[PDB]
Amino acid sequence: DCNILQRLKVKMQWAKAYGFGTERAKFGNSLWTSIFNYAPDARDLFKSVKSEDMRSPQFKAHIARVIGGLDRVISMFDNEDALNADLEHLKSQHDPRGLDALNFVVFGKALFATVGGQFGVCFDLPAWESCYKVIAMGITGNDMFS
Amino acid sequence: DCNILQRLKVKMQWAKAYGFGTERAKFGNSLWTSIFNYAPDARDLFKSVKSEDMRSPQFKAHIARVIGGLDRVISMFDNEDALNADLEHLKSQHDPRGLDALNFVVFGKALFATVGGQFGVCFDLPAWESCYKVIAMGITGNDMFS
Amino acid sequence: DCNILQRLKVKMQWAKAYGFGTERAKFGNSLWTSIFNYAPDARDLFKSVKSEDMRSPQFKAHIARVIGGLDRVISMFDNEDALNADLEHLKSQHDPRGLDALNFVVFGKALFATVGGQFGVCFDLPAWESCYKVIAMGITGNDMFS
Amino acid sequence: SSNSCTTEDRREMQLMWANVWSAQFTGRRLAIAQAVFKDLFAHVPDAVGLFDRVHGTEIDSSEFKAHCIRVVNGLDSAIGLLSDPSTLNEQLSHLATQHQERAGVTKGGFSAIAQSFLRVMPQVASCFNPDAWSRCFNRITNGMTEGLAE
Amino acid sequence: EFCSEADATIVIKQWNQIYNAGIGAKSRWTMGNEIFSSLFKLKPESEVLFNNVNVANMSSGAFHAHTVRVLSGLDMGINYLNDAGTLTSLTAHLAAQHVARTGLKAVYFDAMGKVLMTVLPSLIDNFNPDAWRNCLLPLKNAIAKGLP
Amino acid sequence: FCSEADATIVIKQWNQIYNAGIGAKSRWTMGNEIFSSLFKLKPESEVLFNNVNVANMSSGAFHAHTVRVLSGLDMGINYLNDAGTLTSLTAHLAAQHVARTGLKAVYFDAMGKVLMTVLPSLIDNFNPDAWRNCLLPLKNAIAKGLP
Amino acid sequence: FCSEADATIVIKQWNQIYNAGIGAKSRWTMGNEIFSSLFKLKPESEVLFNNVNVANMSSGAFHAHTVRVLSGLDMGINYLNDAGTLTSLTAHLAAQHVARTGLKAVYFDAMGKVLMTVLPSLIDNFNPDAWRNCLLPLKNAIAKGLP
Amino acid sequence: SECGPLQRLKVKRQWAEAYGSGNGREEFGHFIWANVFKVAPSARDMFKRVRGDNIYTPAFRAHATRVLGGLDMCVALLDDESVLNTQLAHLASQHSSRGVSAEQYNVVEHAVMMGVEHEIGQNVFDKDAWQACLDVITSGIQGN
Amino acid sequence: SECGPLQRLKVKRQWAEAYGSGNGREEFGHFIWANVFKVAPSARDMFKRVRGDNIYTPAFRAHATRVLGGLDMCVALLDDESVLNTQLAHLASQHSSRGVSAEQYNVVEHAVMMGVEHEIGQNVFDKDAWQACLDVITSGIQGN
């Protein structure tokens, strides 16, 4: 359900796994390498950000924008009003792109393997699956994330 | 799911994450610490192996038997004949305990957290959820692992 | 002066002081930093190679060409035929610039400071002043390098 | 350059490979190959015919299996030799003449299979780097298809 | 382009002091509010540009989320100061997001610069005005690229 | 049980031929060789496995049995330096063999000689002493009580 | 240009046969072999060197030319990991070849094949790929614009 | 001695150690063929197309590559008779029109053994297992 | 193969590596002559004055020193035919009254090659260049 406790747990684990400095770029590159290995076809949806070359400034800038979205969103997990306003802002940016909601399921799987892989053994997968649902639901609206 | 490629992937990652010697017990202990943290009630189901004290030899013997089981099962992933006969075996051992199938879902979650936490960012979560289902299904017979 | 023994000495010491790879650019940069410190006015003579900013690629290309020239000339020290034809070549390139010969005396000084500073105490200064003269003379034709 | 197979991409490819490579049993190799061909066939139906001698219609026959093992041995020999291109060149020529003058075997089919590997690898290999991989896979095929049609 | 590696390292370190994954959203919009309040004070005319984010009530979920994404944008820019390639692409994108909105003036970004130079020292331990000026100015110019 | 230095050697040699890294196929081909040998030594014991389809040693049911047996052996070896847990592990394995009517202690003596005969063919510089010192204690614990 | 790992190899192999430590004699004997070969490939280009006395390839004027050519090549290789400066260095070398009427881009292709043919005879475990990846880019920069 | 299931497992592991991942492969194969041609210099003549006169050449090195690649396939298949024999038949056809004598096959056998021992050490080399399983391999490449 | 300008440069460098500055010279020369006398034990008889029966003796070691010293001069002169041939003539006269067969010269050739390869590794040994230039050297020591 992603109650307040799980939200706190997830904020804590994200912070540790996200890190400082360039470790964030590394985290992001891992997250996106996993997304494209999980769903090789999702890569085509990003021609606008030059996904042909993942190490290109255009795509790296995209990686930065996404993990920055994850960061600000997770940081607002404790304030419903701020959280929902931002999730709608994100939805507005993703709708005109007509994206298959299933991709967001793959993204979450990648998010978990990346945060878990960095955080280590005490990673709380159930908490993350539940709270990630809130994000996905807030961005896509597809009740598949209900 | 859990085609032959994912079975090989899983075998690789499991071998790395599982390790040799004493590192095995540590992995074993983390798996079970997650299980009980994820579902505190499941602990009372193990009074027969002294779950009361996870550091006790009785419970360590249990941990060892369980990961040994995961290991021999994962090693047979490529030979359906041996795999199914062995899952049937494990099944005849868990059936008389009237175990609620939802706990096998908790087990898997814990398993993924522990394998990915030890294997790192390249952990293939989708592959593990698919192949774990095959295991759970062979031991429970519940079509929730379908 | 600059008999064959001093030419061999100079070749040895130059090879040590000059070094391989990136250490070459450093030596190059020190040579030119001395030249301009020794005679600040000489800097305006290099606006064509952007001496305005010694860290600029235009000027680094110049530094590289110059030490490369010193190097190929020093390597021919033993073959007068090739050496003179090459000094003539360098001469036809410096002649149309109406360069005051006194600057070649500054260059040498800077060169000695940089070679000896990098080669150490066993630097054979007399040998270098004699053999440098041969170089300067071939490029300028001025009998001050006699 | 720029899309050249660099020294680091080679180290990386040997890594992605050395990992999913079983030095003792054919189980892993075999599985990777078959899957690569299934994928190529499903994307290029007409291609199965080129493998009638090795029973390309029966991917699980002893004959096609032995063929997949040979293909995988060819790729493995080339991946290892990325470290010593002089010899690689000699090896890639020999392979070229082994594919040369065999109707259909054409560069087009190699681009196809290159896509098959890109779809198969990530499923079996951990920490797969598709970019580095393709840059060197291509370097390898280019030597294999020197004398062929588009 | 931008600033030197040594200057960027100082700015990145000083920024991380007050902004990072471990910093709660509340501290973020608290900074966000003091900053925009200061901006509005210096350029009252700019305030109306934020009616879409409910600038009317700055303690509203809509305005909170706005300041949070603004700060996140500044954070992204700062952390990429030593990767000019990616930074250029990041600033280009940010710029587009502003030029898309009308009413913005270049002087509004210079104002923001003053606000930051005024606000940060009260948050950062031993703030370095020179290193920040060296790095912020080019950043601000890249984002305000094309504004009147 | 056995020395910490001995256990170390046993664990190292064993992991040479058995670890989470290779084929279940190899696992059961070692298993079949082990039991086939136990049968030739004590043919009277073959019948005890009729339940795991000992009739056809190439059947999934029997392959799974040997897999199970080797995993147990592996589990015991990897716990040689954890006396407490190993004691508990062998007591359990011991219970799984007692409940089986028809099992004589002498069968575990034969199994011992089989292991000492098969292992050296699979392991580099097999060490009979280090293995004896570590296995025998095990065996007695798993076969303590029976006929 | 070319990778940092590639450049490293090129610089290492090149310094094997060329560095401030050995004889100008060896320098021009490699030079003569290089041009003689360029001539046999494209004899039409030999005339372009009549100014450096290509008539007698053993003359100080021509020896000095090859020396000059190799020093340039050396200067380029040693700057493979300094993209900025190398770009500037090749632009300059590029200007020194354009002003020379009669120079076709194809001559630099032949020069390329000569280098790939001569170098392996002088260098231990010559690496054609690392060299191609680093040289080709160079060559295009020095021959970009010409016929 | 016989190349039984156990010997096949041993050979697989020992070969894996010796052959390795690829870094020591060139030295491995050179050691091998330098032994072959020393024990039987006469045999070089059959390798005219791959510069058998100079085993230091890329051409021969590539050949050596192909040969070891062939042994690897057989060792890897030693526990899968069906496919193993299928592969031996392929090797057989690649050597059919070359007239290789059963004595040259035995030479290469010892060359391969020495090379493997040279790589993993006499301390662990299992001569009986290797001879038996190499017999099984060459024997099949010669039809029988 | 021919000992051309390029091969001469290669040989010079590879020889320099193998021969070195002097620390590994004794082992270098011992490796060489231990090979010579094994391939041709009969030849030792020509070395009675320098204890050819025991190559571990200072007397022979000094001889080995002189021989390598002789190869060094020739390798160093390989790019100066004029002086090279002058030196080969000197070596020729030092061997004239000893009846060395063109077959013993070839032996020493391989001994020297193996030693150099043993010193710098088969990975970089250039057999063609060495054979060609050693032919040129012995060929000249035998007058022709």
Ligand SMILES: *[C@@H]1O[C@H](CO[C@@H]2O[C@@H](C)[C@@H](O)[C@@H](O)[C@@H]2O)[C@@H](O[C@@H]2O[C@H](CO)[C@@H](O[C@H]3O[C@H](CO[C@H]4O[C@H](CO)[C@@H](O)[C@H](O)[C@@H]4O)[C@@H](O)[C@H](O[C@H]4O[C@H](CO)[C@@H](O)[C@H](O)[C@@H]4O)[C@@H]3O)[C@H](O)[C@H]2NC(C)=O)[C@H](O)[C@H]1NC(C)=O
């Ligand atoms: C700027 O916004 C903030 C925050 O507002 C939020 O964000 C906005 C953008 C909108 O999206 C809002 O929907 C959102 O809240 C404003 O501060 C808040 O103001 C609200 C007023 O709505 C405060 O909440 C009061 O109302 C709740 C709910 O009242 C309803 O239910 C009761 C049933 O118990 C009915 O009787 C009412 O008629 C009504 O339908 C109420 O529970 C609170 O009152 C309790 O506490 C009193 C003691 O102080 C008791 O005496 C009462 O009996 C009762 O128990 C609230 O008065 C809300 O607390 C704040 N939020 C915060 C965190 O401060 C801010 O005012 C706004 N600025 C302006 C002027 O626009």
Ligand SMILES: *[C@@H]1O[C@H](CO[C@@H]2O[C@@H](C)[C@@H](O)[C@@H](O)[C@@H]2O)[C@@H](O[C@@H]2O[C@H](CO)[C@@H](O[C@H]3O[C@H](CO[C@H]4O[C@H](CO)[C@@H](O)[C@H](O)[C@@H]4O)[C@@H](O)[C@H](O[C@H]4O[C@H](CO)[C@@H](O)[C@H](O)[C@@H]4O)[C@@H]3O)[C@H](O)[C@H]2NC(C)=O)[C@H](O)[C@H]1NC(C)=O
């Ligand atoms: C002990 O078990 C083994 C292994 O079998 C397994 O374990 C058992 C306990 C059971 O649980 C089985 O379900 C399980 O698989 C028994 O030996 C295996 O038995 C099968 C018999 O089905 C052998 O399979 C051969 O035949 C199949 C299928 O044959 C049918 O279909 C094909 C069309 O695809 C027709 O062409 C046939 O006419 C027939 O109707 C086939 O895959 C193989 O035959 C092909 O390949 C051969 C080369 O290997 C060729 O020579 C043939 O011409 C043909 O092309 C199989 O040979 C299976 O091979 C064996 N296992 C092995 C490794 O040999 C064993 O019988 C049992 N003990 C007893 C006596 O009960």
Ligand SMILES: *[C@@H]1O[C@H](CO[C@@H]2O[C@@H](C)[C@@H](O)[C@@H](O)[C@@H]2O)[C@@H](O[C@@H]2O[C@H](CO)[C@@H](O[C@H]3O[C@H](CO[C@H]4O[C@H](CO)[C@@H](O)[C@H](O)[C@@H]4O)[C@@H](O)[C@H](O[C@H]4O[C@H](CO)[C@@H](O)[C@H](O)[C@@H]4O)[C@@H]3O)[C@H](O)[C@H]2NC(C)=O)[C@H](O)[C@H]1NC(C)=O
């Ligand atoms: C291409 O150039 C080469 C090299 O010459 C250089 O480059 C040229 C472009 C010019 O700029 C030259 O200034 C420069 O040196 C030409 O080949 C060289 O040409 C010289 C010709 O002078 C060769 O020298 C031979 O002769 C000299 C001197 O000979 C006179 O003096 C001696 C007394 O000391 C008398 O004995 C003679 O009667 C004569 O009057 C001498 O040093 C050498 O001759 C001695 O040594 C030989 C052994 O090497 C003996 O066989 C002789 O009997 C004698 O004792 C020189 O052989 C010089 O050797 C060559 N270079 C080489 C390495 O051979 C080349 O001709 C030119 N191409 C053309 C056709 O123009």
Ligand code: HEM
């Ligand atoms: C739930 C996690 C996700 C978050 C937090 C997220 C966040 C973002 C952000 C912040 C942007 C940039 C918006 C802008 O400033 O223009 C963006 C862009 C985009 N996202 Fe996502 N995203 C998520 C998942 C996905 C998924 C699953 C897909 C689909 C495959 C996707 C596809 C895109 C595309 C196509 C763009 C536009 C790129 C461009 O051309 O600029 N996103 N996302």
Ligand code: HEM
């Ligand atoms: C798929 C993952 C699982 C595997 C591989 C597994 C394996 C095993 C094995 C090998 C044993 C020992 C059998 C014996 O030798 O007597 C065992 C015992 C047992 N397992 Fe599991 N198990 C799994 C999941 C579970 C779950 C989810 C529960 C329930 C919460 C469970 C409850 C038990 C209990 C109560 C015992 C008996 C302990 C005792 O001996 O007193 N297992 N399991």
Ligand code: HEM
């Ligand atoms: C003996 C030492 C010197 C050597 C070896 C040397 C060498 C060279 C070389 C190789 C070039 C480049 C030629 C080309 O490729 O176009 C060059 C250019 C030049 N040198 Fe020198 N040089 C020396 C001393 C000097 C001195 C003392 C001055 C005067 C202060 C000087 C002034 C210049 C100028 C103005 C250029 C042209 C830069 C340009 O391309 O714009 N050089 N020199």
Ligand code: HEM
């Ligand atoms: C780069 C990846 C590839 C590798 C490493 C590879 C390798 C090999 C090898 C080792 C053989 C056996 C040679 C022999 O022993 O005679 C072979 C055969 C063959 N290959 Fe490939 N191959 C590749 C791609 C392809 C592609 C893309 C096609 C065509 C669509 C193709 C078609 C064939 C055919 C028709 C044969 C002959 C099979 C037979 O009947 O024996 N190969 N290949």
Ligand code: HEM
């Ligand atoms: C240099 C510091 C600044 C940074 C890092 C920054 C960053 C951002 C970001 C990240 C957004 C959200 C873009 C999106 O996702 O759609 C945004 C929106 C906006 N910014 Fe800025 N900004 C800065 C300065 C300014 C200034 C000086 C003004 C003008 C007075 C301004 C006016 C706006 C407006 C009007 C919006 C649109 C709000 C909406 O969606 O309703 N920004 N800014």
Ligand code: HEM
């Ligand atoms: C010391 C080496 C041995 C080890 C490690 C070992 C291990 C095992 C294991 C793990 C099981 C399966 C228990 C279960 O999950 O229910 C088992 C079953 C069994 N073992 Fe052993 N065992 C050994 C020696 C023997 C010997 C010497 C005999 C005697 C002939 C024997 C007879 C049996 C029988 C009859 C079963 C039950 C088979 C069935 O399920 O039908 N074991 N053993």
Ligand code: HEM
């Ligand atoms: C990529 C390899 C090459 C390098 C590094 C190179 C380098 C040089 C250098 C440094 C010079 C002397 C410039 C000066 O100081 O004035 C030069 C001159 C020249 N080069 Fe090249 N060059 C290369 C290839 C070629 C090729 C392929 C041709 C064509 C046939 C060529 C034709 C010339 C000519 C005609 C001159 C002028 C000679 C003279 O002074 O009379 N070069 N080259």
Ligand code: HEM
């Ligand atoms: C130890 C077992 C041996 C294996 C696994 C083996 C394997 C191979 C392989 C894979 C090829 C390349 C075939 C191709 O791609 O065309 C080959 C070629 C060849 N083998 Fe063997 N071989 C073995 C023993 C021998 C022996 C004992 C001789 C004889 C002295 C021999 C002589 C040749 C010749 C002459 C070629 C052809 C080289 C060429 O292409 O010109 N092989 N062998």
Ligand code: HEM
């Ligand atoms: C590889 C080329 C060879 C070189 C460079 C070489 C060089 C030399 C040198 C420098 C000496 C000492 C001369 C002196 O100071 O008196 C010498 C002596 C001698 N060499 Fe060689 N030699 C070569 C090959 C051979 C061969 C092939 C044989 C015959 C088997 C041979 C037999 C002898 C003998 C018998 C002596 C005299 C030892 C003595 O003083 O008693 N040499 N050689």
Ligand SMILES: [Ca+2]
């Ligand atoms: Ca029940």
Ligand SMILES: [Ca+2]
């Ligand atoms: Ca003048």
Ligand SMILES: [Ca+2]
């Ligand atoms: Ca090795």
Ligand SMILES: [Ca+2]
């Ligand atoms: Ca034999």
